[PDB]
């Protein structure tokens, strides 16, 4: 606090202000196309010869 | 949107910074006095003599 001789009026003090933050989320969209030439081939578990 | 971006307000983040009392623990005695000045009388008593 300010020391002020008791005669005089006193000292005026400043306030200070808010601030704000604002955020908009990002967007994610993966996709795959499932062709026959990805359906057809052998899956590893499948037997030899006659899959 | 369009006219104005809608918002959600999430709770305010109040940081109230303070100066906690440390040295005032060695000044526990309080005197409220209207007189002009405070005064001490300090006495030395060398009672250690033979």
């Amino acid at each position: 606090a300010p020391f002020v001789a008791p005669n005089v009026q006193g000292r005026v003090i400043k306030e200070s202000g808010y601030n704000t933050k604002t955020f908009k989320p990002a967007y994610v969209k993966p996709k795959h196309v499932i062709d026959p030439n990805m359906i057809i081939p052998r899956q590893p578990g499948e037997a030899l010869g006659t899959g | 949107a369009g006219l104005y971006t809608t918002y959600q307000l999430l709770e305010v983040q109040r940081k109230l910074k303070t100066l906690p009392a440390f040295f005032l623990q060695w000044f526990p005695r309080q005197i409220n006095f209207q007189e002009d000045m405070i005064a001490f009388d300090k006495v030395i008593q060398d009672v250690t003599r033979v």
Binding site: K21, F23, K24, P25, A26, Y27 | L10, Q13, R14, K15
Partner: protein
């Protein structure tokens, strides 16, 4: 850049490869971080948890691993100045693991140590480390992170 507005002062740099560095200088750097966060935080929360990058932890051991676990060192049950419990030996894994607790006497000053070397596949399909490996991150639950999901 979705900049969350963290103070630029909290993104620090120091050279633990420099000549003459010691364990206490490194902990001094980490506590410079702790001070800045305690000053800047809205809750004033003190950081208890440090996450080390792999290279950062390797440098940390390379420099301070003698003053740590040495006699007269920070880990010596005959000298009652500390309760540190950082392990001599640790697994190596592509993951996260807990190296123990770098504490002072009555819980004072503790800094839980974590090392992170987990890896993820980048947008360009390059594999990369999740935690920056040449850096140490101090964090606390006071970050009160929000996971945000907009409208589909």
């Amino acid at each position: 850049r979705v900049d969350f507005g963290r103070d630029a002062a909290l993104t620090m740099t120091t050279d633990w490869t420099a000549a003459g560095v010691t364990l206490m200088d490194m902990i001094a750097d980490l506590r410079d971080g702790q001070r800045l966060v305690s000053d800047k935080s809205m809750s004033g929360t003190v950081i208890r948890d440090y996450i080390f990058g792999g290279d950062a932890w390797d440098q940390f051991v390379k420099v301070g691993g003698k003053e740590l676990w040495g006699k007269d060192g920070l880990m010596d049950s005959t000298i009652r100045g500390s309760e540190t419990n950082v392990t001599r030996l640790w697994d190596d894994v592509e993951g996260v693991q807990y190296m123990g607790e770098l504490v002072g006497a009555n819980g004072a000053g503790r800094m839980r140590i974590w090392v992170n070397t987990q890896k993820y596949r980048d947008q360009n399909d390059q594999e990369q480390f999740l935690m920056k490996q040449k850096a140490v991150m101090g964090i606390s639950s006071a970050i009160e992170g929000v996971r945000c999901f907009g409208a589909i």
